[PDB]
Amino acid sequence: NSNICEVCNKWGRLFCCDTCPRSFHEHCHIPSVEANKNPWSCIFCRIKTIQERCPESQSGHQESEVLMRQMLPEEQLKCEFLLLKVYCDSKSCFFASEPYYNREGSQGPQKPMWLNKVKTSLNEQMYTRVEGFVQDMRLIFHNHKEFYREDKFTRLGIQVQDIFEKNFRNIFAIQETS
Numbered sequence: 660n661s662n663i664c665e666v667c668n669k670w671g672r673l674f675c676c677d678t679c680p681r682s683f684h685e686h687c688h689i690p691s692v693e694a695n696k697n698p699w700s701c702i703f704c705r706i707k708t709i710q711e712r713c714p715e716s717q718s719g720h721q722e723s724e725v726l727m728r729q730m731l732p733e734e735q736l737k738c739e740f741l742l743l744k745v746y747c748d749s750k751s752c753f754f755a756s757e758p759y760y761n762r763e764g765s766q767g768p769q770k771p772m773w774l775n776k777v778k779t780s781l782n783e784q785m786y787t788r789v790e791g792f793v794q795d796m797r798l799i800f801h802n803h804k805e806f807y808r809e810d811k812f813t814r815l816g817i818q819v820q821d822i823f824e825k826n827f828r829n830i831f832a833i834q835e836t837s
């Protein structure tokens with residue numbers, strides 16, 4: 660198994676996947692690594708199993724259909740993975756914790772949002788449809804773009820949004836387009 664956490668790339672108290680060589684800190688894995696279960700399979704392995712069980716699940720989909728899906732266990736898992744994929748990028752640190760807004764010439768957003776809040780919401784089963792999760796994720800980056808205006812710091816929002824959107828298209832098998 661790897662000797663660093665797959666998400667944060669640090670050593671420490673790691674839990675090892677039994678079906679692949681990845682390792683995780685307890686709260687880096689999403690959901691948080693489970694108390695018992697021997698063997699244990701990580702979220703990457705659980706997602707791979709869904710695909711393998713239903714190969715046709717990788718045929719192209721319309722985003723509009725994906726967003727209206729109810730958050731049954733498999734969609735719940737997919738959103739947890741997609742959230743985890745954003746945490747995997749080091750630039751997610753900027754969007755992880757609760758932000759504050761005091762910049763000359765800008766006003767803060769009406770509805771602040773951040774990754775740890777989305778993480779809690781997923782954990783507490785507060786989203787009934789994929790759309791709920793996706794809207795909060797996109798709001799993160801949209802609030803950032805709006806607040807930072809022409810400061811070059813706006814690019815961090817573009818960059819992390821691009822990681823989100825690419826992973827969304829991959830995980831939910833969105834029909835490729837030009």
Ligand SMILES: [Zn+2]
Nearest residue numbers: 664667684687
């Ligand atoms: Zn970690």
Ligand SMILES: [Zn+2]
Nearest residue numbers: 676679701704
């Ligand atoms: Zn694994």
Ligand SMILES: [Zn+2]
Nearest residue numbers: 712713714715
């Ligand atoms: Zn099938």
